[PDB]
Amino acid sequence: EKSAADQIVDRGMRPKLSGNTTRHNGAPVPSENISATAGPQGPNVLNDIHLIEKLAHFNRENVPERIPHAKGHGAFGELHITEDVSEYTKADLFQPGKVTPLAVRFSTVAGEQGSPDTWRDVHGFALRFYTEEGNYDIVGNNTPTFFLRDGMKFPDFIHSQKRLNKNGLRDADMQWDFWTRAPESAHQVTYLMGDRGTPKTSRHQDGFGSHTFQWINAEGKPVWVKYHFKTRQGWDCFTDAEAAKVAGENADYQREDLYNAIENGDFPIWDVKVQIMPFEDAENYRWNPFDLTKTWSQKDYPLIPVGYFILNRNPRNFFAQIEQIALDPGNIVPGVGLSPDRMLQARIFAYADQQRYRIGANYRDLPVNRPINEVNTYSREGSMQYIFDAEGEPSYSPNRYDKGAGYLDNGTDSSSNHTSYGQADDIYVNPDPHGTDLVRAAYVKHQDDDDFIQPGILYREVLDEGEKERLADNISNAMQGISEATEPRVYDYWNNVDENLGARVKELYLQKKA
Amino acid sequence: EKSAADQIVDRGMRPKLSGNTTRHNGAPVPSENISATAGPQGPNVLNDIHLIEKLAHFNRENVPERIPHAKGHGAFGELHITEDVSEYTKADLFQPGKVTPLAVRFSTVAGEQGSPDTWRDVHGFALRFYTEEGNYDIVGNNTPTFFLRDGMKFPDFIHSQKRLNKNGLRDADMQWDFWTRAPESAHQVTYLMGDRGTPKTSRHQDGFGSHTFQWINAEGKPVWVKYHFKTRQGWDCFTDAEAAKVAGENADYQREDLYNAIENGDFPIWDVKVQIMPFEDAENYRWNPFDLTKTWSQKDYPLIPVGYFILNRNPRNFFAQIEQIALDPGNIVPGVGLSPDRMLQARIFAYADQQRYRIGANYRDLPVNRPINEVNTYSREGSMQYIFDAEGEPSYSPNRYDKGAGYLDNGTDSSSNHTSYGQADDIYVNPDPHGTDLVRAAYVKHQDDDDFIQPGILYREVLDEGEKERLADNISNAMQGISEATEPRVYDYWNNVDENLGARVKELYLQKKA
Amino acid sequence: SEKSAADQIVDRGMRPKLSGNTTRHNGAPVPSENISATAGPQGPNVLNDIHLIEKLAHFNRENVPERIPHAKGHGAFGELHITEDVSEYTKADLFQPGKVTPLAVRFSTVAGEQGSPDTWRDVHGFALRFYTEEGNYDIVGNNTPTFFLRDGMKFPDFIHSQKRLNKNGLRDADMQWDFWTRAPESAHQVTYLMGDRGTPKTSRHQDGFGSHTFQWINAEGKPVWVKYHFKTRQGWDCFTDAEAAKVAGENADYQREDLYNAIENGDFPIWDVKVQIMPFEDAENYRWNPFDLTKTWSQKDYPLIPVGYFILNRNPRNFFAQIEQIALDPGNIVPGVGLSPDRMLQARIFAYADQQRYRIGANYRDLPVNRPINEVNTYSREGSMQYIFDAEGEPSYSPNRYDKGAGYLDNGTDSSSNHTSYGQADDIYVNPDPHGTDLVRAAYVKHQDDDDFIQPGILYREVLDEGEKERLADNISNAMQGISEATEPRVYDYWNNVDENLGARVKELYLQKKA
């Protein structure tokens, strides 16, 4: 409470009503209890209008769930800026003193809508900031990295984490068959199989933008950034056995936790920080700075504070404001840009594409998805158009009226006669493409770029002995059910991360198997 | 290793393919691994055609799940008739020696896709018989009764069993607030709260049609019937604690069990039996024979054997044949009719209505939904029309061609000139309607009709002391979370079933409270 | 009437002829198609007349979103026959010597909706599918060698300006000309459109063109740039503005009916397939930007080279199922064919399948008319109305330990990590110099004679005969009726910039008719 988000979360909400019910045309309902028949023991009549309306709308309550990240929950709150980063970005929401309303949705990845919150899985950490220059979404995860570096492979990964086509069962052999044949997965798989694969709540986990993004300042100068959201509640994790116990006791443990916390005034807080890499330092970093499977060392690029955000408002209506929210990494704003991360670039297409289907063509007009400023667009019509332009405004640009065109355009013509605008920094200021042809090529290879060195460093230099052993324990548990064919491939995969981890994984797996 | 269902389940299946993949136009795919960029570090190009197609179709994999009964699984098999019931029904599939292909889907009711199979719940038990006179579906449950006697109340019950609007949580206070204020629920709630609320598998439970239906013989003579599907595997139930434990360990426990049992050759079997009430017996029965909340005593109307069915074929593709199956109690055939059960009459509208939305206008044309005989219909067009009529056939009747009209019609005119056909026995031969006006009325009151006698009979005359105790223990567990306002309502509700059950419920409830 | 190579395709999905009585969609017999069930003869209609509700509910769902644009159209099926040897230029299977390939075609107008006249003045779509052994190859062309714009960003602006005002649902001359004069790149196509060819009499009496520059690649990987021309053996034959408007009223489906009748009568329409072929190394030196859709290649510089012909010899069996639901897409390319740096073309490669996913459904590729003759081997799955599914238990992901496979550049067993590179994506196109290394918003590379007006001026001054030149001015001044006073001088200047004599005659005729 009480709360900069109130202007957003109150949108679309009816006043409280009493007395009797009405049909959807507003006329009084005679009964919610008894349907009309032709004689007490006679047949139901076709023209019990309320009955049919009630049943027919009930029949249409469900919509396609997200793929992936179907199971989730969220809240609203406030972003507060506490440091001055104007030398790096001109983005309005990050300027000194700014307070911006936010929405957040937390989620798992693989499971469907009814599935337990505490299955071992990556957790989504997706933020919307309702800024004065548009909705800026940072659609992140509770991990600084991810399983892949090319969006072409994303549907393969997600099918491998979901259900077999023949019987609708999730499958260990399929999961490890994919992971070990796509060894770029090694970094994120090591993270996933550790303690953090099973955080207790949504409040007790960090969030990350994961990808490298770009910040552009008022002079048009760019820097590369990575977002970190550090939990003030601290990381707190279940064991593998505890996470499964909780799954059976309360499939909605984390959903209920976050709701309860906010209701109790126990508002969770994250500190907003960035790693900042100078534009010209990208090519010489020991790892490729645009490879999603590579984190930037915090020794090389320490966390730099920006502000914090707080979750202080539960949704008014879960379906309307959480299920229907359309969080999209393509929702960037002036002062923020993308990068040559191929995963990120695929995502920039993919989210709005699914949302057009899952919600509908006009999903942007729903209360939770509208920005605080008016949208000035030539888009029109489409299913369920609630909002429409002022009477008689033009439908095309360039036109002879006032509605306007792009800020690069003159508003009066098509920019013919060989007009050029130059570098598209609003997308991003690009580094060298390293070629002039359309190609299918590897990422530029940096000195320490391979699939295994980073999880190896995590194991050897970061984890304590308890974490190392639990990791081997979790892995060997997650291997139960794989085929004889897959066993040696998995042994080798873990040996590539680290030989001691590999040995312990194999030892524990064989102990546990019959 | 063959099944009568082989003809059905092979419909729509591709041959095994190898080599390289193709785009959906059939052109070869260059890579499933790397996307095309403008330079190795350049931006992703818009025209990686395969990339966009792969992502866009991935984005559209999900469809609305069923409401209710979202979480389910199934198989295919054979119905075998071993008795002669031709005196009672002319239905082709029920004639002596008939062997009919079948499909079945089992499910829970309240939870979404991915919710655990072993949540306490009713379990769906929905059969399709691919008969020579059309698909006959018996969309039943693992209970002989149900929670309500009027379809007007059905969406209220289902919302109460799903999630609160504000926070997406299922809620004990909500569930009990509804049940106690709709005391007609008492019979089914007593059944649900016992051992049978947690069957171990889909094989270890009976199925029932629940509703009274009608059978009509070759002479047009009607009798009232109830369907019973008696498991040869026998009832086998988890305790409340065991069912929760399984939910956390394997959310798909029953799905996996049925698949494995069939794959292993352990084909589950049910004996098909009916209760048969003479048409003239209906008005005289001690209970209203059309009240879904009332079972017919098996001492008054014993089970009469018809035959058995066996499940001997797993689906080829789970989504295509199970998620997309459209089971519908309105799928009746000659020899079978409905009844003045208002729940049944609402369902006859409701299923196809949801299926037109959930699947699409042309859902009937999907492989699993087509009958074995050709469909002769004047319906046309609609989204995704795969199947169309012979070239140039007429789109309207009556017409000057050969396509035809209804079997009561002459095929050449509109049946004007005050043509009449008489009683619609294909719907059902109706009993006395007990009035001539459109009304909202009670069911005709029979001698022993109330909301509490039958679950009371179950408790006092059927359950053993161990069943009675676990019942109270289950109920008192399910009460955890109710408000103080709701507490005495729940006490009264159980006292009304049996005062000893009620007192034991309260005792355990207070012990556990906190 | 005997047969077509396309018979395999058009018979897919068709029921046998049925008689006797109707059935519900579960297959059970229908009692009546004439009388519904009531509780007593004068009593209320009962809910459980199952057939009544099913019949009404399916009726209620017959309509689907029409195409935007090109809503009004019709088509046929036929055969492509190769009669020359172009193997030196392309390896595309359907273009090899002696090949006979089944085809579909859809013709259309552009702006009007489904009920609108075939003979409103408009571009006509000329959209072909070839069901080749290496996939469906679609050439989604028009009856003009050029088009109104050179950047896809402007396409929705053009199409809204050709459709209806938001306030009142009326089409509007002022809006059309306000857009065209503010987007002068449109001058070439507007000149073509406002001439005789804006009103061809039938679908049979017009040429077709691919319009865009595409690429051909041969068996050795060498590319050439190409433009497709489909030259009508029936000959161009056009209405005057007045005749076309009269026919629009007399028979809104004049062209749909003509094509159906012609094929039923055995008068199978034929087009000769030809290409212009520009050597890859010629591109930078051509007097016009060879990738700018608003620029044609002179046939004096690049003469038509013959490839073969195609013939339409089969009417659809069912119009909705096979024509309304056809999903023609320029992104349906096959080996031996590539794209080009034409920005309109590149936008289209995204746009069509996107609209088809919506207007038909996620699984539109599986409908009979959209399936290729070869089996599709894909990891795509599920989605609404999935009819076809993979063999039992096949994997849903690659790389996998099974045999389903992966891309032809992949090894089928791993993810191509360890810094694997495949090189130039020639299956998209062998690209020319990009002329920059940054993401930019820039003009096309400017060639010697590139502007918005020289080509229609050439058409007017060097190609059109005196009657065509006069009918052009007359047609233009008719289409101008309704423009605002503010719009008048813009249109005067526009036509002046094409040709000062044309502009003078347009203004003269316009003022005479005003008013």
Ligand SMILES: NC(=O)C1=CN([C@@H]2O[C@H](COP(=O)(O)OP(=O)(O)OC[C@H]3O[C@@H](n4cnc5c(N)ncnc54)[C@H](OP(=O)(O)O)[C@@H]3O)[C@@H](O)[C@H]2O)C=CC1
């Ligand atoms: N650089 C980054 O953006 C991050 C990297 N990592 C992993 O740590 C390795 C070292 O990175 P670097 O920043 O150079 O070294 P640092 O020592 O500076 O950082 C180590 C990071 O690992 C986190 N961590 C601690 N325990 C676990 C665990 N059980 N599972 C997963 N993460 C844990 C730490 O969180 P805390 O400080 O609270 O203990 C800290 O953020 C990398 O290889 C990467 O795999 C992990 C998080 C962020």
Ligand SMILES: NC(=O)C1=CN([C@@H]2O[C@H](COP(=O)(O)OP(=O)(O)OC[C@H]3O[C@@H](n4cnc5c(N)ncnc54)[C@H](OP(=O)(O)O)[C@@H]3O)[C@@H](O)[C@H]2O)C=CC1
């Ligand atoms: N009449 C019916 O179609 C059914 C009735 N019932 C319940 O039994 C009561 C008496 O019916 P009536 O047929 O006259 O008496 P019966 O004694 O003839 O039948 C009692 C029925 O209850 C079943 N039953 C046994 N234990 C349980 C339990 N733990 N939970 C639910 N059902 C159980 C029996 O199955 P079994 O033979 O395996 O012991 C049997 O089918 C009714 O009030 C009703 O609640 C239950 C199922 C069917």
Ligand SMILES: NC(=O)C1=CN([C@@H]2O[C@H](COP(=O)(O)OP(=O)(O)OC[C@H]3O[C@@H](n4cnc5c(N)ncnc54)[C@H](OP(=O)(O)O)[C@@H]3O)[C@@H](O)[C@H]2O)C=CC1
């Ligand atoms: N180059 C091309 O791909 C085409 C160009 N044009 C137009 O012709 C101009 C000259 O091109 P170029 O190839 O150098 O000259 P060419 O003399 O070699 O060909 C001129 C083309 O214009 C066609 N034409 C004739 N009358 C009309 C008319 N009423 N409306 C539209 N087109 C007509 C001709 O068709 P026909 O031989 O049957 O008389 C011929 O194809 C261009 O500026 C362009 O506007 C038109 C069609 C194709």
Ligand code: HEM
């Ligand atoms: C190329 C790789 C990826 C693609 C194509 C992709 C695509 C998608 C799509 C289409 C959705 C559903 C969106 C919706 O329907 O509203 C989704 C959900 C989501 N994705 Fe990804 N994703 C990718 C990788 C990632 C990465 C790397 C992250 C984090 C850094 C991420 C985080 C999320 C989150 C948090 C959600 C749920 C958002 C919400 O809570 O509503 N994804 N993804």
Ligand code: HEM
């Ligand atoms: C008026 C009361 C009821 C109404 C309006 C109703 C409506 C529905 C609807 C609309 C569906 C989804 C169907 C689909 O989308 O394919 C459904 C599912 C189902 N219902 Fe009911 N229902 C009612 C009561 C009952 C009763 C009394 C039974 C058992 C006798 C039952 C058994 C089932 C089963 C088994 C399913 C899932 C079928 C499957 O596995 O696909 N329902 N119900």
Ligand code: HEM
């Ligand atoms: C950037 C420019 C353009 C875009 C974005 C575009 C987009 C579209 C779209 C989305 C459709 C609907 C397709 C469907 O729903 O099946 C369509 C129809 C069509 N377009 Fe375009 N178009 C463009 C320019 C052109 C050009 C230059 C041509 C010809 C060379 C063309 C020829 C056609 C034809 C013939 C149809 C109808 C196809 C049929 O008969 O089904 N369009 N266009």
Ligand SMILES: [Cl-]
């Ligand atoms: Cl609908």
Ligand SMILES: [Cl-]
């Ligand atoms: Cl869509």
